[PDB]
Amino acid sequence: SNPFAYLAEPLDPAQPGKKFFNLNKLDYSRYGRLPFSIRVLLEAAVRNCDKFLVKKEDIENILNWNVTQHMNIEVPFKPARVILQDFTGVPSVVDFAAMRDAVKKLGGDPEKINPICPVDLVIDFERNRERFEFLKWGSKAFRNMRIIPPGSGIIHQVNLEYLARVVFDQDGYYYPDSLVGTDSHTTMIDGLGVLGWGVGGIEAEAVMLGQPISMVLPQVIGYRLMGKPHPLVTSTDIVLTITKHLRQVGVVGKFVEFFGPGVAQLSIADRATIANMCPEYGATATFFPVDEVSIKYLVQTGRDESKVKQIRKYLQAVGMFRDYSDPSQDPDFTQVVELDLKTVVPCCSGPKRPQDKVAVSDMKKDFESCLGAKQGFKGFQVAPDHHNDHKTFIYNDSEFTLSHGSVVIAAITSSTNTSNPSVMLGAGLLAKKAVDAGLNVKPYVKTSLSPGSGVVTYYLRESGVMPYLSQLGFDVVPLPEPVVEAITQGDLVAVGVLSGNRNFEGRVHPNTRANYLASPPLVIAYAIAGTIRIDFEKEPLGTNAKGQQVFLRDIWPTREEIQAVERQYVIPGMFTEVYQKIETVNASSDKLYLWNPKSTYIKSPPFFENLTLDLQPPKSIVDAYVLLNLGDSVTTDHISPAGNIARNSPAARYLTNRGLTPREFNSYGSRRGNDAIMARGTFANIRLLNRFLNKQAPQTIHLPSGETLDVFDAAERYQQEGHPLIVLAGKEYGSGSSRDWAAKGPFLLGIKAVLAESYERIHRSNLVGMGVIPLEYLPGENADSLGLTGRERYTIIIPENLTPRMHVQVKLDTGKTFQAVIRFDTDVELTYFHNGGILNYMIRKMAK
């Protein structure tokens, strides 16, 4: 079967059917030292080794990471599953449908056509009910394709964790969960042992057609984490520390793997945050190997104990269960950067500028100094004798002593950083501790809570903290006269204590001449203390309403406590609710899709019209026309654009043909299901620079005519007349964001070959995928260098026993001949070429 079969063994001898490839018996001297991520890549490559899509030397390369990491070599990564967000999967599902159709047309069980891996269509208005119904049809019709519908009261990330597997138990195997997504938050799951990241519809679709993600074997930076943090330090402090640090270290385009005792101190939430912020510091992924915390957490989500213990069982079996408290398991990372948690210092910001940072234990000092100095960001010249002023006042029939640098406003609000919930919970437990200690927040202080929407809801509801928060006046959501007076009259510098990184300048009160940003717990604490002028280490927070003294340390809750509660109640409640919702949402046959011609969004593609089940030998492109003559860096959006449709476009006209108004046009993206619209929108980008026109215009010159018209129509009459079409380009052709149709389009137009000096990786692969020929000039040649005008008829001589990366001959109607590099880089791509599309190849492969 597969050359590494000798490595597969029952995970449990009783169940000889359920097997696993034991990498320990592959070369423990090297394997035992690999990073766990590389271990995942390895496992997947090994397990999927088939002498074609994944060859032996690939396994050898991955395995020989410690050396191959430095040779910048491309290995295959074959993920366990795939995530398609919202309607990004439409093109895919459509493709597979059309495939089933073709296979039926050629006589063969269509129910063979299926995504190689599990596929999840996740969703967050009557416009798209059609598409939804379509995707649902997909979920019904396809094997291992689940759909999560809208109306699920549950939050995307939470959903992704819900769809987490960690260890696949399936097809009689045990393997590590790994994925790729047309999704924003994908990488977050790497906070939980699952390895994966974001890609484009085309890559995802390849992974769905079992084509492995070709990828340069990444270096791995080891982030070692040790030491205990100072109690006032919070998840946000830590996460931010790590993120900035990593931003400094320059891990761009490599893997970041975490290790060291300290990792134990990072909750899955923390790890997930840290992991999802990775595209900041550019890391391709940030791996947090599966451990005891991960397992416990997995139990806490309400997973099946048995399958959890199973997961652990296989992880230890295959050697991918982590013991951070055991340096003698540590991989030999490319580089090691460290972090001592007693380095992170709790810092507030102010008193006039967010960027003006200040330690928690230098508050009294820094403030008194700011009183010292004169008008400025870190000063408010108050006569050095007024420095101890203090005016009294009356609030609802009671007297208080408002003094310099007292706190008038105390506002806790969300922080965009996804480590908010834990910190909020922290504030909560602090409040609670303070209520227990019998402390209060003096009535006059303008106190407020605004945690925002999302997961924090669970962190607040399920810990039962809201009461304690509200008791200190911190309920969920113009200050007192006596305060205004006492302030202005007393000539006091008033302090506003805030929590939240959003719009600081836009919520500085006028009566307050000083404003500080802090962590919510710290907010509550300062609001309790009354005045920021205080060192919590010497001066107590307050005297009980029963005598004894209480300091901040006494009520401040430890990360251990916070995590404890989070784990015991929050996670359970949350996921209970998630299961309930999932359940009550699903309640809201035909194995071939019936297309509605009255449709505008979903149509069957041409692709496999006349698709024979016999091979189609190398077809020599004889005397073809240069459709487009483009410059350097023609982008994906240039090739197949996004955004709304203009009224002067072939798209808008084909739409106009069908009683459609510019209002009910929608965007090119929402028409990704229509080869018509998409093919008509190809190269229809206003900013398109065609050298045939020396101006920015989505048009070309139909040589036999001299008429300059829209590319779709030009190519239309071209292909009607039956003219082979090629495209000329320059450097980094195809660069840019993901555009599903950047190949399908040019394919449908009639482009048989593109010719450039320099291609973009993904794009070339995609072209080869659709079966378009990618041609590359020789080193030091190009359009002008060879004097090509684009006005010639082109003959591309294609040999019979064509081999990869080979030089092939281009000759002109003008007798002008020259060599070009045919960019089929492997026998796989030569195959895809000879079949004329990975789709075709898969169809033929399944119809047998």
Place this chain on the structure above:
RNA sequence: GAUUAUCGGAAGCAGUGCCUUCCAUAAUC
């Protein structure tokens, strides 16, 4: 003008949010 939108683009980091600002593109009023 406002508003809304995009398989849009660029930038920004109290600090990475599918946030904010700007640009393009369109539709609604």
